[PDB]
Amino acid sequence: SDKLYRVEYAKSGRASCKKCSESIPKDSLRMAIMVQSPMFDGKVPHWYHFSCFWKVGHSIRHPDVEVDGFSELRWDDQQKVKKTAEA
Amino acid sequence: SDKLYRVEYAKSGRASCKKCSESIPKDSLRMAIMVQSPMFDGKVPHWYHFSCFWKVGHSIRHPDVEVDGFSELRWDDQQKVKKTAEA
DNA sequence: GCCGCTTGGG
DNA sequence: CCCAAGCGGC
Ligand SMILES: [Zn+2]
Ligand SMILES: [Zn+2]
Numbered sequence: 001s002d003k004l005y006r007v008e009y010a011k012s013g014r015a016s017c018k019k020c021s022e023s024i025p026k027d028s029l030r031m032a033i034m035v036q037s038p039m040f041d042g043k044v045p046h047w048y049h050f051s052c053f054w055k056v057g058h059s060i061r062h063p064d065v066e067v068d069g070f071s072e073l074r075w076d077d078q079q080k081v082k083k084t085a086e087a
Numbered sequence: 088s089d090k091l092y093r094v095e096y097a098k099s100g101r102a103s104c105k106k107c108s109e110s111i112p113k114d115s116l117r118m119a120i121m122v123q124s125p126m127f128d129g130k131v132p133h134w135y136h137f138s139c140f141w142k143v144g145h146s147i148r149h150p151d152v153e154v155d156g157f158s159e160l161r162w163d164d165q166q167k168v169k170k171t172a173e174a
Numbered sequence: 175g176c177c178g179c180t181t182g183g184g
Numbered sequence: 185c186c187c188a189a190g191c192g193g194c
Contacts, residue, residue, distance in 0.1 A: 039185055
């Protein structure tokens with residue numbers, strides 16, 4: 001995927017939020033900025049809590065196309081993403 | 088539990104049959120005799136392919152009460168175990 | 175318990 | 185890609 005963002009239910013509880021540095025609980029809704037690695041050739045996620053992600057300021061117009069993983073979210077959460085992005 | 092035997096769909100494909108020595112395929116029906124390790128507070132399974140389990144002299148009168156995991160098997164496999172035990 | 179395979183974080 | 189945790193086998 002060449003998308004800039006990723007959203008998903010946390011696969012583990014081990015990722016640390018880049019903003020607040022607190023861990024992100026398994027299964028919770030988390031979002032990443034996908035960035036190029038300096039260790040190897042490929043993208044790595046910078047994970048944030050859902051709310052922390054928005055606090056650091058993004059202009060995502062069409063979440064469905066711009067955020068990888070969007071379509072695999074529960075409808076409930078897809079709507080929370082769209083809603084949040086628009087505001 | 089405290090039961091001597093366990094039956095389940097194999098959690099991996101890595102276990103080797105203690106009768107025939109061949110690997111037990113992931114998700115296949117497998118059976119174990121359970122033994123207490125003197126090295127740690129935990130039970131160790133000797134796994135077997137379903138068919139091989141009966142060829143080594145392991146024997147079962149009441150699967151329902153003797154074999155841990157029996158009631159969680161698919162109906163088909165419950166009747167297979169019960170039938171094979173009676174035989 | 176120990177260890178290797180697999181998964182996940184980076 | 186490297187490293188470490190989680191899981192599975194024993
Ligand atoms: Zn955060
Ligand atoms: Zn066998």
